[PDB]
Amino acid sequence: ATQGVFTLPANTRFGVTAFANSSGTQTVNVLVNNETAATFSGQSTNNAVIGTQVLNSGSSGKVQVQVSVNGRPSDLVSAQVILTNELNFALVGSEDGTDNDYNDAVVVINWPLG
Amino acid sequence: ATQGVFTLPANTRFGVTAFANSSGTQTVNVLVNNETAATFSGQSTNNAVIGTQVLNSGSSGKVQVQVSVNGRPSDLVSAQVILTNELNFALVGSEDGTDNDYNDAVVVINWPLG
Amino acid sequence: ATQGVFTLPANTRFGVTAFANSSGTQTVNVLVNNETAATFSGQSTNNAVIGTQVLNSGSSGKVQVQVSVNGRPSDLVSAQVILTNELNFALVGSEDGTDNDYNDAVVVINWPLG
Amino acid sequence: ATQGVFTLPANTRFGVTAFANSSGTQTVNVLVNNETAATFSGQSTNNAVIGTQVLNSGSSGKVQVQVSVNGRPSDLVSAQVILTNELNFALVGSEDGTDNDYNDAVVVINWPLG
Ligand SMILES: CO[C@@H]1OC[C@@H](O)[C@@H](O)[C@@H]1O
Ligand SMILES: CO[C@@H]1OC[C@@H](O)[C@@H](O)[C@@H]1O
Ligand SMILES: CO[C@@H]1OC[C@@H](O)[C@@H](O)[C@@H]1O
Ligand SMILES: CO[C@@H]1OC[C@@H](O)[C@@H](O)[C@@H]1O
Ligand SMILES: [Ca+2]
Ligand SMILES: [Ca+2]
Ligand SMILES: [Ca+2]
Ligand SMILES: [Ca+2]
Ligand SMILES: [Ca+2]
Ligand SMILES: [Ca+2]
Ligand SMILES: [Ca+2]
Ligand SMILES: [Ca+2]
Numbered sequence: 008a009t010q011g012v013f014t015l016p017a018n019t020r021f022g023v024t025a026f027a028n029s030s031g032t033q034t035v036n037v038l039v040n041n042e043t044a045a046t047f048s049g050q051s052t053n054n055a056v057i058g059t060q061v062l063n064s065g066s067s068g069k070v071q072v073q074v075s076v077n078g079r080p081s082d083l084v085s086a087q088v089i090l091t092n093e094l095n096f097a098l099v100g101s102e103d104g105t106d107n108d109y110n111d112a113v114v115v116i117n118w119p120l121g
Numbered sequence: 122a123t124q125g126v127f128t129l130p131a132n133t134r135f136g137v138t139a140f141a142n143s144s145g146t147q148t149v150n151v152l153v154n155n156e157t158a159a160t161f162s163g164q165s166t167n168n169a170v171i172g173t174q175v176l177n178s179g180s181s182g183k184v185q186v187q188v189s190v191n192g193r194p195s196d197l198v199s200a201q202v203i204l205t206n207e208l209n210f211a212l213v214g215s216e217d218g219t220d221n222d223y224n225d226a227v228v229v230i231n232w233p234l235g
Numbered sequence: 236a237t238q239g240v241f242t243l244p245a246n247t248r249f250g251v252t253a254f255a256n257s258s259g260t261q262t263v264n265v266l267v268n269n270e271t272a273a274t275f276s277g278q279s280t281n282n283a284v285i286g287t288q289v290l291n292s293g294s295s296g297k298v299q300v301q302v303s304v305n306g307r308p309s310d311l312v313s314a315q316v317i318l319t320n321e322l323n324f325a326l327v328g329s330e331d332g333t334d335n336d337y338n339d340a341v342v343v344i345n346w347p348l349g
Numbered sequence: 350a351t352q353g354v355f356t357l358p359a360n361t362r363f364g365v366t367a368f369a370n371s372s373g374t375q376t377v378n379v380l381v382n383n384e385t386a387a388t389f390s391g392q393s394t395n396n397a398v399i400g401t402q403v404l405n406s407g408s409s410g411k412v413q414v415q416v417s418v419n420g421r422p423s424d425l426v427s428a429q430v431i432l433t434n435e436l437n438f439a440l441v442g443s444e445d446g447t448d449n450d451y452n453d454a455v456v457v458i459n460w461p462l463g
Contacts, residue, residue, distance in 0.1 A: 008319040008426045008444065008451060010350075022168035026136060028234050054136035054234045059170050084204040084350045086428045089315040090214050091198045091236040094223040100208040102350065108233060109208040109350060113136075115229050119222055120142050120168045122312045122330065122337060122433040124236075198236045200314045203429040205350040216236065223236065250396035254364060256462050282364035282403050282462045289395055312432040319426045322442040322451040328432055336461055337436040343457050347450060348370050348396045 010083040011072040013097040013116065015064040021118035023072075024059040027051040029111035031076035031103045037114075038071040039064060057112075061120060074112045076103040084109050095119070124197035125186040127211040127230065129178040135232035137186075138173040141165040143225035145190040145217050151228075152185040153178065168227075175234065188226045190217040198223055209233070238311040239300040241325040241344065243292040249346035251300075252287040255279040257331055257339035259304040265342075268295035285340070289348065302329035302340045312337050323347070352425040353414040355439040355458065357406035363460040365414075366401040369393035371453035373418040373445050379456075382409040399454075403462060416454045418445040426451055437461070 015021060025035040025047045037045040039062060047058025064070060074081040081101035088096050097116035100109035129135055139149040139161040151159040153176060161172025178184060188195040195215035202210045211230035214223035243249060253263045253275045260278040264271060267290060275286025292298060302309040309329035316324050325344035328337035357363060367377040367389045379387040381404055389400025406412060416423040423443035430438050439458035442451035 008424055008449070010319070012320050014320055020167075022140060024138070024140075024170065024229075026138075026231065052235050054134075054173075054175055054231065056138070056170060056173050059168075061168055082350055084208060085319075086202060086204060087317040087320070088200060088202050088212065088430065089317075090200060090212065091221070091223055091238065091313075092240050092242055092315070093221060094198065094214040094227070096202075096210070096212055096229075098202060098204065098210050100204050107205070107207060107350070108235070109205055110231070110233060110235075113208070113231055115138075115210075115231075117140065117168065117224070117227055119224060121166045121222075121224075122238075122310055122335070124433065126434050128434055196236055199433075201431040201434070202316070203431075205352065205427075206354050206356055206429070221236070248396075250368060252366065252368075252398065254366075254459065280463050282401075282459070284366070284398060284401055287396075287398050312436060314430060314432060316428060316430050316438075316440060318428060318440065318442050319449070319451050321449060322426065322455070324438070324440055324457070326430065326432065326438055328436040335433070335435060336463070337433055338459070338461055338463070341436070341459055343366075343438075343459075345368065345396065345452070345455055345457075347452060349394050349450075349452075 010085040011099050013070045015068045015070055017066055017068045019064045019118055020061055020120045021116055022061055023116045025057045026054045026113040027057045028054055029103055033112040034075045035112050036073045040067040040069050072099045072114045074101040124199040125213050127184045129182040129184055131182040133178045134175055134234045135230055136175055137230045139171050140168045140227040141171050142168055143217055147226040148189045149226050150187045154181045154183055186213045186228045188215040238313040239327050241298045243296045243298055245296045247292045247346055248289055248348045249344055250289055252343050253285050254282045254341040255285045256282055259331055261340040262303045263340050264301040266299040267293050268297055300327045300342045304331040352427040353441050355412045357410045357412055359408055359410045361406045361460055362462040363458055364403055365458045367399045368396045368455040369399045370396055371445055375454040376417045377454055378415045380413040382407055382411055414441045414456045416443040
């Protein structure tokens with residue numbers, strides 16, 4: 008199944024933050040309406056924040072996270088969880104290798120903000 | 122029900138990261154085995170990452186998040202999510218006021234690292 | 236925080252199923268737009284299905300689960316999780332006693348159907 | 350990533366319940382320690398509970414859900430969610446066709462019981 012794809016309400020500000028846990032240099036691209044709206048990169052085996060930004064979901068509400076290491080797309084896992092019918096988390100894990108820890112780049116999307 | 126309390130595997134590194142979305146200054150306390158192990162504070166209505174840290178879950182694995190605003194404890198909501206039976210997120214929202222957006226301080230705990 | 240309340244898409248069929256894990260008979264009420272849409276009653280300490288029904292979210296999309304034992308409201312815990320940006324679960328646990336297992340009545344709401 | 354595989358605590362009672370939402374007859378197999386422990390079959394486009402059962406995770410704690418339709422394995426999507434650090438749900442959706450609703454068989458595992 009498709010992973011790392013989320014539908015947000017239109018024209019909604021959302022946070023996106025990425026962490027790295029790998030010997031591979033992570034590139035995290037955040038697409039809004041199928042167009043790259045943010046790009047983060049970095050390398051850490053200690054969960055370093057490699058990027059954080061506030062974006063707007065725009066007219067489509069279409070948000071997609073992609074992760075690559077050396078030009079190769081990582082395998083993604085994702086889900087959305089909603090707390091008290093108000094607070095949204097869109098969560099993404101990724102695997103760049105053979106150990107199946109899925110933490111190589113970890114991406115957290117949250118909304119609403121403010 | 123108790124919120125913001127999580128049983129992690131014992132003696133395991135985890136990331137804890139806090140975001141602010143309130144006019145009130147947030148103070149986030151992270152307890153490991155009932156002792157403060159980290160404290161983050163800031164004020165933002167735009168999802169500022171007021172703190173991020175790697176901690177060890179210790180002998181019990183008990184991790185507790187508490188949030189206060191001008192010395193008043195915020196109301197918490199929480200859940201844990203596991204993807205592909207490997208990637209763990211413990212999630213906390215908090216409310217310091219009356220609008221019930223529960224984003225006033227948002228705390229994300231993630232493991233495993235490395 | 237409020238628990239057991241969910242905003243579904245309008246005019247959408249959803250499944251509701253309730254399980255019992257308590258020595259006391261559980262009364263589960265499902266409200267749609269603040270009015271009774273279904274009520275389940277049964278007793279099991281072995282996860283018996285005490286009710287299952289297809290309902291419609293109607294014009295409000297507001298669905299609320301309440302649980303009581305002997306007319307005394309149980310303490311609720313809930314969340315919504317969305318898989319592959321398509322499949323929705325609204326989950327409820329309840330506690331009627333002192334052991335905090337929160338399984339005394341467990342309610343699972345799923346959509347879309349068909 | 351592997352889906353539909355969950356590690357439960359050893360020797361834990363759990364419920365497993367399967368719902369159908371497809372023109373195709375669903376076959377759901379539940380394995381414990383790599384051996385079939387429950388099987389359900391049925392066709393519904395109205396979220397019928399095609400089966401529910403209580404099992405024990407045994408010494409391994411390894412529980413796997415498989416879904417097939419007329420001999421072909423469905424594509425699975427899964428996650429686990431824990432409420433109030435106590436109440437567990439392991440969630441499975443599956444897709445047997447082209448519309449990607451992932452509801453064709455839905456499987457919910459819950460613990461603790463009792
Ligand atoms: C060579 O493997 C990569 O770096 C070290 C670990 O973080 C692994 O999970 C990762 O896939
Ligand atoms: C005065 O209210 C506080 O600041 C503005 C908003 O962020 C509110 O959600 C928050 O509770
Ligand atoms: C009297 O206690 C009730 O019945 C037995 C157990 O299922 C308990 O969890 C429940 O609260
Ligand atoms: C022919 O398609 C199958 O039956 C009707 C719908 O339930 C579809 O989701 C399912 O994949
Ligand atoms: Ca890896
Ligand atoms: Ca890694
Ligand atoms: Ca607020
Ligand atoms: Ca706020
Ligand atoms: Ca109980
Ligand atoms: Ca119980
Ligand atoms: Ca389908
Ligand atoms: Ca279907």
